[PDB]
């Protein structure tokens, strides 16, 4: 204590008596105006840095395909489901492979791969595992494929010696990740995500309560129409397929902990005929798109191995990380023709917790919901009226550009729009982004702060951007936010002028 | 085409639909490598925001340490963060705060605390987040910790006998003199044993302060990581966080001891306050005030004279234990962490390092490195550095956000010189007001000016400001309208994981609740429990009766369903449909399924006599995982099943020992023993029992009571 | 019979390990609730993920071994596996499934009647929803942010500390302290719940947790639209938020709601007997609370502890609460109007004006609570600074302004001399004079033309542009035409703020409360009801009530 004190006094009394016969006169102002010469504390306006540099944007190699999942270009095996012989969800594939699947075989010279001959050999230790039970018997080739490493350990103690003597070459370093460019393919896989698919309904979701006339009408009315409208998108699809695999490999985890087993990559739906004749039934069943291979290692990390099926070429660009195949052709057809089968394939890693937040993908639909409903409540509260119904055909949100032209949709259908922004902030989910968007909230402020004309101001804009550049590295979504943003920027500029453009 | 999601932003206003700028629906961050670096960096940092080349050796440590306060070696850049903090104007704020609410103000508020704390039974320590084991070395939940620190008071010296916070101090304090310390330590043999330790050590163990490597922190690319004080640091600190929270309380600035649905009013008021305040001159304006390393800015030193400054009239007997908190982390010792790795351009060989052994390897480190490190070497000690200035971050929030409504409170006359407004802990909203647009300037610029005199950095880079209609607290954005988000509490929705009744009746008062504060549409509401629902019966393996779908749970409901009539009305864990809605959130499904049960069903499920808002039907223990007892974690847990076993017994002697916290001035064992005598006689006399056998439990009785005796 | 020996051997074992037989006997019995508290049961980092992990093996769960023994079969209909003899606890672990067996197939009768008083609380708060009728429409509703107010309310609500000494009383007798004060008073209610759960040892621990519950209104800070009873506050979801709206719901409400309405006019009368003779006020008011007993729905209970211990703070129960010692602070009692104060400070100086008076010479700030309106003011040197009123009813915010305007007390104050000096001037109570906020309030409450007159007395403007929907009528309307100055209209309601405080100080003569040293809470007499109604209601000695023949 006697030394602890911060004053020019000593001992603690004196601290203590300067303390208890305390009287502050007015000086304070003084201070703080010789303090305010020192300061030159920056008295910022917004109409002088309005510019805010448009947005910095890293330059490089294109990012590459973050997602575990191939989700565009992936491709489906359809199987109509029995509910005894389904149930397991891991003999699933058993009873595929008495199908089609067990004449696919690819060829050891492949496009654009990385390690050929490794996930070749697996393949077929996964092919020949599911025959007899779907586990992979290796000691072995777990630990390689596991290290595609181990890294010998030395005490301290002993050491000594190799200092004063320095073999080995001795020394220590740490690496970053590279950084990588604005990607192109998004805009398309979200143009993907966004439309119907042919099947109807992936994710799960459970029956409806008893209702009163006042309220659950309404909300059961809402739900079964934003469901209806949300469960046709493919934006759904890949939301079914990572819970239902995610949660299977989770499974699996308790199960055969240091194992290395064969887990499918699935999703359950259910197609929907209204034609408006008596059909045998709406089609009930479950669809593949490729298999996956877990490896406990490390509590810790998984890795895991991805094999996906795929009918469209791929991008170098893109799928730098991917490792394809040329596995042979594919039957697909219509009617009011067989193409070439790829197979994609890549390692990764799995967090417990990314496998639990992954495995609960539904929640994205809740944070739409909010989103959509409120704007209807908020419209039709104005007006007194049941305005739902109305608001959401009639009032237009704006979507996208084509030809130059801002485009806007109507809130039914700019809604997956929402659901698939959603989604994706669940998959792509860096610490990048989670700076981005917390650092982003001030732009969007300032910009509705010039919206109203409320004449507002930021103090450091440099760097503020500085830490939004600093947050942008290699996370595909984070950097396409971006650049959406800027547009953003530009488009507003061009409405109201309180920013620039180059 | 070009799809852009953010085009949406233009037509409609921002603060409806900032719930879709954040993404909550996906995981958080997570830590990777050496936490080490960012300690350090973070050492570096406080000590050159304590902008101060004054140092001075300790008596004590042989060490240097650098105080300070008032003493400024003023940089350039002052805008950039600052640490100094000067005390004579920081009692000014402490006056000119008391003197604007009351005149006991201080007095009052530190006598409600000396009331609670003087009640206070040390036990309720264990209460509250991990701390650090000084024991064993490692991080713990405070209770564990708390058991081994007074067992091994117990082993030294003698079983504590204090039963309040007070003695529990006194015993802290007087262990500091001890020159010597025994404790439960496990030394495996190719088992827990007795290991001592020197005064010298100790001291140092005490000071000393864990590093977490953060997780479940939202919003940031670098991890911002946490620090878990010691047990014997921790009451002192608890002390004056209940005198902070006394003075938090009455003030109405402040936004930290009222949070949630409250928070949003004080705001409201406060507005509205400010609009009537206003003259037809004056023009009001609004800033969002966001702080960056507001802990590495404060100071204990200063915190140490303020609490002198607040315990001035209050009472010696309790001043004294006001300023021992300070102190402790004046004189704070830092742990460093995991360490650094060595690797040769092979992949082949590493080698791991301590943080011991850091001082070793001197130039072999990358550059980086070396100039972080080579100052620190001064501070430094074997495992351990040693910083006076920094405070830690989380401990003294309450103390915080007092220092910060201390510069709100209020000043120097001058037209439309007027600011206030909110201030949770490093989070400030700062309205100000003047006569011209000119003005608004100086003044803000003034209020800045006095915030940074005191270590109260604003973020230049992240806070903005505009008109008073735009501005964010906390998440919560304002408007006319006032913050529609559901953000916040999106990973409680899910089943909370204790038992299938309790799990759902949980998660519906929970989406009610959500539904009233949080102000979520309904229809949200609705899909929000049907997917609870969903979730729960995946996590629960459970089915409706009309689905389709088959396992093991499901085959039993396959003979179940021709025997009940109404299907309807059965539960969900034993495999039926939804009935609750947004109407009946409030009802706990067992009683509005209850009535149109069957008769058989209600009889056999709910009865008492069983293998079996909160509902009863279903209650059952987790097993605890093959982990924890597989280490020598359990060759220490080897003391903490001696204490269960026990209360298993008392009780099964008294019934209510659970219910009703068991007083009177008597032993355990001898209210047990006088207990199991009345109940004896009890049974004995009017009941059941033979005589000779009441004998042989008397027998028992005093066989036990020699035992004990003994002992 | 062996029960309690192989307790009595346990403890044998128990006090021969030295270890534990030191820390059993060393100190209280307290102890135990510090010895309990070193054993968390697991960790709890990952919750979701772990109930998940949990249920995901078939045999995880802890079970009990016995009665299941005893009851039904351990082995399955279907032959996959249920039971084991393996193994530290006496609890043998089992399959999930095999619970919603013995729910299909297990023998057990006539448990139905046992269960729902248990749970009176819950399956009452579902009896309720029953009896209520609907009806659906949306608006831009401006709710009413922040009022404490009970939800969850059951008849005999009560504090927490005795609720407690019921809770031990109504378990089991063989361990229970012979606590007087709320036993010999609240006896009969104590009768009724031992009766009924006393007597079938069924889940002992947990009925004492919901009993608990049972009698606990929540009071919590919550956003209200008017509808301000607290049965309504328990599903007030389901009826509102800022953007909908429910109907036909004030009627379905319990016995209770009234009961307290009741006891402010029961101490509107006690405070008035005690007004009736100014020799003493503090020793006769006292002898007419303790004597005066309750009779609630079920159980009669003491006039004392419904006073100490009732929630809702009226005027007169501030009055009837301070003879006793019972700490009820931040609340502030002007007449018929609710107030509170936020901000600064002052002292209370003697200023004589002509028509001595009492004047504060504070920059206050304080907020506004009258029937369907709500407002804010600001008072400095004696005169209304700032003001602004966010009331439903024109009336009602006139009340407000004028109400408001008395305390504030102005210059113009003094100038109004209708009368006064014949009647209001000095009260007719053994030639006591009245204090002088409260006659011109008195003659304000007297007529029609009297709230014109002072309402007139305020400058008056013709309010300019950008205040046409916030200017106030002299009538109470939003119209600006003409105005009065100094005052705002709010479109919309006003937050009412809160403080958990307790100040309790003793009474003067004349049933004023100097309380937190000045203050004037007591505002004297609310309001002159000279009626005499009442129903099951007790009186006694010399009660000055003529309800005593010969």
């Given at each position: 204590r006697d030394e602890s004190v911060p004053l020019p006094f000593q001992t603690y009394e004196q601290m203590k008596d300067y303390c208890e016969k305390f009287k502050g006169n007015p000086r304070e102002l003084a201070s703080k105006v010789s303090q305010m010469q020192s300061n030159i504390k920056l008295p910022i306006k917004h109409y002088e840095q309005n510019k805010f540099r448009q947005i910095r944007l890293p330059k490089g190699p294109m990012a590459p395909y973050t997602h575990k999942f191939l989700m565009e270009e992936a491709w489906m095996f359809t199987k109509i489901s029995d509910p005894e012989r389904s149930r397991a969800g891991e003999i699933l594939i058993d009873f595929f492979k008495k199908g089609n699947l067990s004449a696919i075989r690819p060829k050891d010279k492949p496009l654009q791969g990385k390690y050929p001959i490794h996930y070749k050999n697996l393949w077929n230790q996964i092919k020949a595992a599911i025959a007899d039970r779907t586990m992979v018997i290796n000691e072995n080739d777990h630990s390689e494929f596991l290290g595609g490493r181990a890294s010998k350990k030395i005490p301290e103690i002993s050491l000594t010696q190799?200092?004063?003597?320095?073999?080995?070459?001795?020394?220590?370093?740490?690496?970053?990740?590279?950084?990588?460019?604005?990607?192109?393919?998004?805009?398309?896989?979200?143009?993907?995500?966004?439309?119907?698919?042919?099947?109807?309904?992936?994710?799960?979701?459970?029956?409806?309560?008893?209702?009163?006339?006042?309220?659950?009408?309404?909300?059961?009315?809402?739900?079964?129409?934003?469901?209806?409208?949300?469960?046709?998108?493919?934006?759904?699809?890949?939301?079914?397929?990572?819970?239902?695999?995610?949660?299977?490999?989770?499974?699996?985890?308790?199960?055969?902990?240091?194992?290395?087993?064969?887990?499918?990559?699935?999703?359950?739906?259910?197609?929907?005929?209204?034609?408006?004749?008596?059909?045998?039934?709406?089609?009930?069943?479950?669809?593949?798109?490729?298999?996956?291979?877990?490896?406990?290692?490390?509590?810790?990390?998984?890795?895991?191995?991805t094999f996906e099926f795929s009918i469209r070429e791929p991008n170098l660009e893109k799928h730098q990380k991917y490792t394809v195949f040329e596995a042979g052709h594919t039957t697909v057809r219509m009617k009011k023709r067989e193409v070439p089968l790829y197979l994609y394939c890549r390692t990764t890693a799995l967090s417990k917790i990314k496998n639990d937040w992954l495995s609960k993908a539904r929640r994205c639909f809740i944070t739409t919901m909010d989103t959509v409903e409120t704007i209807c409540l908020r419209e039709s509260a104005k007006a007194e009226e049941n305005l739902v119904e109305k608001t959401l055909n009639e009032k237009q949100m704006w979507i996208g550009k084509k030809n130059g032209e801002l485009i806007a949709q109507p809130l039914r259908e700019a809604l997956r729009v929402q659901l698939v922004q959603q989604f994706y902030f669940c998959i792509y989910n860096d610490s990048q982004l989670e700076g981005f968007c917390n650092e982003q909230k001030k732009i969007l402020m300032a910009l509705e702060g010039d919206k109203k004309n409320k004449s507002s101001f930021g103090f450091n804009p440099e760097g503020l951007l500085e830490k939004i550049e600093e947050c942008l590295i290699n996370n595909p979504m984070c950097l396409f936010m971006a650049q959406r943003l800027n547009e953003l920027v530009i488009e507003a500029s061009k409405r109201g002028a309180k920013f620039f453009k180059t | 085409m070009e799809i852009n999601p953010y085009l949406m932003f233009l037509n409609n206003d921002v603060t409806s639909l900032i719930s879709t700028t954040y993404p909550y629906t996906g995981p958080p961050p997570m830590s990777h490598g050496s936490s080490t670096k960012y300690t350090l960096e973070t050492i570096k940092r406080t000590y050159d925001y304590s902008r101060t080349s004054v140092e001075k050796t300790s008596k004590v440590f042989n060490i240097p340490r650098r105080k300070f306060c008032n003493c400024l070696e003023d940089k350039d850049e002052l805008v950039k963060?600052?640490?100094?903090?000067?005390?004579?104007?920081?009692?000014?704020?402490?006056?000119?705060?008391?003197?604007?609410?009351?005149?006991?103000?201080?007095?009052?508020?530190?006598?409600?605390?000396?009331?609670?704390?003087?009640?206070?039974?040390?036990?309720?320590?264990?209460?509250?987040?991990?701390?650090?084991?000084?024991?064993?070395?490692?991080?713990?939940?405070?209770?564990?910790?708390?058991?081994?620190?007074?067992?091994?008071?117990?082993?030294?010296?003698?079983?504590?006998?204090?039963?309040?916070?007070?003695?529990?101090?006194?015993?802290?304090?007087?262990?500091?003199?001890?020159?010597?310390?025994?404790?439960?330590?496990?030394?495996?043999?190719?088992?827990?044993?007795?290991?001592?330790?020197?005064?010298?050590?100790?001291?140092?163990?005490?000071?000393?302060?864990?590093?977490?490597?953060?997780?479940?922190?939202?919003?940031?690319?670098?991890?911002?990581?946490?620090?878990?004080?010691?047990?014997?640091?921790?009451?002192?600190?608890?002390?004056?966080?209940?005198?902070?929270?006394?003075?938090?309380?009455?003030?109405?600035?402040?936004?930290?001891?009222?949070?949630?649905?409250?928070?949003?009013?004080?705001?409201?008021?406060?507005?509205?306050?400010?609009?009537?305040?206003?003259?037809?001159?004056?023009?009001?304006?609004?800033?969002?005030?966001?702080?960056?390393?507001?802990?590495?800015?404060?100071?204990?030193?200063?915190?140490?004279?303020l609490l002198a400054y607040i315990t001035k009239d209050s009472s010696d007997l309790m001043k004294d234990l006001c300023s021992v908190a300070p102190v402790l982390f004046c004189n704070k010792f830092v742990k460093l962490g995991q360490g650094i790795r060595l690797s040769n351009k092979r992949k082949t060989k590493e080698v791991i390092i301590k943080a011991e052994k850091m001082g070793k390897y001197k130039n072999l480190m990358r550059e980086e490195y070396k100039n972080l490190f080579e100052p620190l070497e001064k501070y430094i000690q074997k495992d351990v550095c040693f910083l006076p200035g920094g405070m830690l971050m989380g401990m003294?929030?309450?103390?915080?956000?007092?220092?910060?409504?201390?510069?709100?409170?209020?000043?120097?006359?001058?037209?439309?010189?007027?600011?206030?407004?909110?201030?949770?802990?490093?989070?400030?909203?700062?309205?100000?007001?003047?006569?011209?647009?000119?003005?608004?300037?100086?003044?803000?610029?003034?209020?800045?000016?006095?915030?940074?005199?005191?270590?109260?950095?604003?973020?230049?880079?992240?806070?903005?400001?505009?008109?008073?209609?735009?501005?964010?607290?906390?998440?919560?954005?304002?408007?006319?309208?006032?913050?529609?988000?559901?953000?916040?509490?999106?990973?409680?929705?899910?089943?909370?994981?204790?038992?299938?009744?309790?799990?759902?009746?949980?998660?519906?008062?929970?989406?009610?609740?959500?539904?009233?504060?949080?102000?979520?549409?309904?229809?949200?509401?609705?899909?929000?429990?049907?997917?609870?629902?969903?979730?729960?019966?995946?996590?629960?393996?459970?089915?409706?009766?009309?689905?389709?779908?088959?396992?093991?749970?499901?085959?039993?409901?396959?003979?179940?369903?021709?025997?009940?009539?109404?299907?309807?009305?059965?539960?969900?864990?034993?495999?039926?449909?939804?009935?609750?809605?947004?109407?009946?959130?409030?009802?706990?499904?067992?009683?509005?399924?209850?009535?149109?049960?069957?008769?058989?069903?209600?009889?056999?499920?709910?009865?008492?006599?069983?293998?079996?808002?909160?509902?009863?039907t279903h209650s059952f223990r987790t097993r605890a995982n093959r982990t924890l007892l597989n280490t020598d974690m359990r060759a220490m847990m080897a003391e903490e099943k001696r204490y269960q076993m026990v209360c298993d017994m008392f009780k099964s002697v008294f019934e209510s020992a659970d219910i009703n916290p068991p007083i009177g001035a008597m032993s355990i064992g001898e209210a047990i023993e006088e207990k199991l005598l009345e109940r004896a006689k009890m049974k004995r006399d009017i009941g059941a029992i033979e005589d000779s056998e009441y004998e042989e439990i008397k027998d028992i009785i005093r066989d036990a009571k020699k035992a004990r005796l003994e002992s | 019979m062996s029960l309690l020996l192989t307790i009595a051997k346990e403890y044998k074992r128990l006090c021969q390990d030295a270890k534990a037989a030191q820390m059993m006997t060393v100190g209280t019995v307290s102890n135990y609730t510090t010895f309990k508290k070193w054993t968390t049961s697991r960790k709890e980092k990952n919750p979701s993920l772990r109930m998940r992990w949990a249920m995901s093996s078939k045999f995880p769960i802890i079970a009990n071994k016995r009665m299941l023994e005893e009851a039904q079969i351990p082995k399955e209909h279907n032959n996959v596996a249920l039971w084991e003899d393996t193994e530290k606890r006496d609890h043998v672990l089992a399959s999930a499934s095999c619970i919603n067996y013995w729910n299909f197939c297990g023998p057990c009768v006539n448990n139905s009647e046992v269960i729902k008083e248990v749970y009176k609380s819950r399956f009452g708060r579902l009896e309720r929803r029953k009896e209520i009728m609907w009806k659906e429409l949306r608006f831009t509703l401006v709710d009413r942010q922040r009022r404490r107010v009970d939800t969850q309310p059951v008849e005999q609500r009560l504090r927490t500390g005795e609720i407690k000494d019921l809770q031990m009383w109504t378990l089991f007798e063989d361990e229970a302290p012979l606590a007087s004060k709320f036993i010999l008073d609240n006896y009969g209610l104590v009768k009724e719940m031992r009766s009924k759960f006393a007597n079938k040892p069924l889940n002992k621990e947990v009925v004492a947790h919901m009993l608990e519950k049972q009698f606990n209104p929540e009071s919590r800070f919550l956003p209200v639209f008017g509808a301000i009873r607290p049965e309504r506050m328990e599903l007030i979801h389901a009826l509102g938020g800022e953007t909908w709206i429910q109907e036909a719901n004030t009627a379905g409400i319990s016995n209770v709601d009234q009961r307290k309405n009741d006891i402010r006019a029961v101490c509107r009368k006690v405070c008035l007997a005690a007004n009736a003779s100014i020799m003493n006020a503090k020793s006769k008011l006292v002898e007419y609370?303790?004597?005066?007993?309750?009779?609630?729905?079920?159980?009669?209970?003491?006039?004392?502890?419904?006073?100490?211990?009732?929630?809702?703070?009226?005027?007169?129960?501030?009055?009837?609460?301070?003879?006793?010692?019972?700490?009820?602070?931040?609340?502030?009692?002007?007449?018929?109007?609710?107030?509170?104060?936020?901000?600064?400070?002052?002292?209370?100086?003697?200023?004589?004006?002509?028509?001595?008076?009492?004047?504060?010479?504070?920059?206050?700030?304080?907020?506004?609570?009258?029937?369907?309106?709500?407002?804010?003011?600001?008072?400095?040197?004696?005169?209304?600074?700032?003001?602004?009123?966010?009331?439903?009813?024109?009336?009602?915010?006139?009340?407000?302004?004028?109400?408001?305007?008395?305390?504030?007390?102005?210059?113009?104050?003094?100038?109004?001399?209708?009368?006064?000096?014949?009647?209001?001037?000095?009260?007719?109570?053994?030639?006591?004079?009245?204090?002088?906020?409260?006659?011109?309030?008195?003659?304000?409450?007297?007529?029609?033309?009297?709230?014109?007159?002072?309402?007139?007395?305020?400058?008056?403007?013709?309010?300019?542009?950008?205040?046409?929907?916030?200017?106030?009528?002299?009538?109470?309307?939003?119209?600006?035409?003409k105005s009065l100055r100094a005052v705002t209209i709010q479109s919309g309601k006003i937050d009412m703020p809160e403080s958990k405080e307790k100040i309790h100080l003793e009474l003067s003569d004349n049933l004023e409360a100097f309380d937190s040293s000045g203050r004037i809470v007591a505002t004297i007499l609310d309001l002159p009801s000279d009626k005499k109604v009442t129903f099951q209601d007790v009186s006694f000695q010399h009660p000055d009530l003529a309800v005593l023949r010969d």
């Open positions: 190799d200092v004063i003597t320095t073999e080995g070459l001795k020394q220590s370093e740490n690496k970053l990740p590279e950084p990588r460019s604005f990607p192109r393919w998004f805009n398309a896989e979200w143009m993907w995500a966004i439309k119907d698919s042919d099947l109807t309904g992936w994710v799960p979701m459970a029956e409806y309560p008893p209702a009163d006339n006042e309220l659950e009408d309404y909300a059961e009315h809402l739900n079964k129409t934003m469901e209806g409208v949300l469960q046709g998108t493919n934006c759904a699809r890949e939301m079914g397929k990572c819970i239902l695999t995610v949660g299977a490999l989770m499974t699996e985890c308790r199960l055969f902990p240091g194992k290395i087993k064969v887990v499918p990559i699935y999703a359950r739906s259910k197609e929907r005929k209204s034609m408006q004749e008596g059909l045998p039934v709406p089609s009930e069943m479950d669809c593949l798109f490729g298999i996956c291979v877990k490896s406990k290692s490390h509590d810790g990390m998984y890795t895991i191995i | 963060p600052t640490g100094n903090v000067d005390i004579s104007s920081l009692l000014g704020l402490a006056e000119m705060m008391e003197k604007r609410m009351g005149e006991g103000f201080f007095k009052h508020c530190v006598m409600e605390a000396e009331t609670e704390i003087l009640k206070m039974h040390f036990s309720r320590l264990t209460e509250g987040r991990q701390t650090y084991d000084w024991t064993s070395e490692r991080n713990m939940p405070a209770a564990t910790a708390l058991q081994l620190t007074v067992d091994a008071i117990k082993e030294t010296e003698g079983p504590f006998k204090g039963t309040t916070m007070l003695e529990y101090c006194n015993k802290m304090i007087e262990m500091l003199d001890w020159k010597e310390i025994k404790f439960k330590k496990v030394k495996t043999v190719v088992v827990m044993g007795i290991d001592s330790i020197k005064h010298d050590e100790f001291l140092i163990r005490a000071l000393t302060i864990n590093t977490m490597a953060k997780d479940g922190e939202r919003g940031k690319l670098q991890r911002r990581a946490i620090a878990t004080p010691g047990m014997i640091v921790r009451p002192f600190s608890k002390i004056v966080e209940t005198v902070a929270q006394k003075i938090c309380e009455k003030l109405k600035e402040s936004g930290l001891p009222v949070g949630g649905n409250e928070k949003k009013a004080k705001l409201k008021t406060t507005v509205t306050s400010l609009n009537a305040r206003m003259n037809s001159d004056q023009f009001a304006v609004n800033i969002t005030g966001d702080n960056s390393k507001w802990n590495e800015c404060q100071q204990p030193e200063a915190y140490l004279a003294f929030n309450m103390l915080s956000t007092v220092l910060g409504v201390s510069t709100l409170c209020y000043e120097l006359k001058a037209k439309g010189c007027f600011w206030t407004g909110l201030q949770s802990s490093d989070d400030f909203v700062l309205f100000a007001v003047a006569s011209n647009w000119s003005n608004i300037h100086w003044t803000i610029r003034r209020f800045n000016a006095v915030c940074k005199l005191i270590g109260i950095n604003m973020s230049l880079e992240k806070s903005y400001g505009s008109l008073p209609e735009l501005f964010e607290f906390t998440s919560m954005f304002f408007d006319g309208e006032f913050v529609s988000n559901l953000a916040m509490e999106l990973p409680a929705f899910t089943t909370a994981g204790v038992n299938e009744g309790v799990d759902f009746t949980a998660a519906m008062s929970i989406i009610k609740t959500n539904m009233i504060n949080n102000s979520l549409s309904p229809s949200t509401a609705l899909m929000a429990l049907r997917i609870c629902l969903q979730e729960f019966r995946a996590t629960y393996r459970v089915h409706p009766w009309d689905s389709r779908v088959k396992g093991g749970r499901m085959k039993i409901i396959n003979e179940f369903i021709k025997t009940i009539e109404n299907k309807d009305g059965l539960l969900i864990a034993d495999g039926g449909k939804l009935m609750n809605n947004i109407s009946t959130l409030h009802i706990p499904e067992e009683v509005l399924k209850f009535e149109k049960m069957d008769e058989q069903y209600r009889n056999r499920v709910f009865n008492p006599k069983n293998p079996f808002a909160v509902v009863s | 609370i303790k004597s005066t007993s309750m009779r609630i729905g079920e159980t009669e209970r003491k006039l004392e502890e419904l006073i100490l211990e009732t929630d809702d703070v009226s005027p007169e129960v501030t009055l009837c609460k301070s003879a006793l010692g019972g700490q009820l602070g931040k609340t502030l009692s002007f007449g018929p109007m609710l107030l509170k104060k936020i901000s600064g400070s002052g002292v209370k100086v003697k200023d004589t004006v002509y028509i001595q008076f009492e004047y504060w010479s504070e920059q206050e700030e304080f907020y506004g609570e009258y029937k369907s309106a709500t407002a804010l003011f600001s008072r400095k040197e004696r005169s209304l600074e700032w003001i602004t009123i966010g009331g439903g009813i024109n009336e009602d915010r006139k009340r407000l302004l004028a109400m408001c305007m008395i305390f504030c007390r102005d210059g113009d104050y003094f100038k109004d001399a209708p009368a006064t000096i014949t009647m209001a001037d000095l009260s007719t109570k053994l030639g006591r004079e009245i204090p002088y906020q409260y006659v011109m309030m008195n003659w304000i409450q007297k007529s029609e033309d009297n709230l014109e007159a002072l309402l007139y007395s305020r400058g008056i403007v013709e309010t300019n542009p950008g205040k046409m929907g916030s200017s106030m009528g002299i009538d109470g309307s939003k119209r600006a035409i």
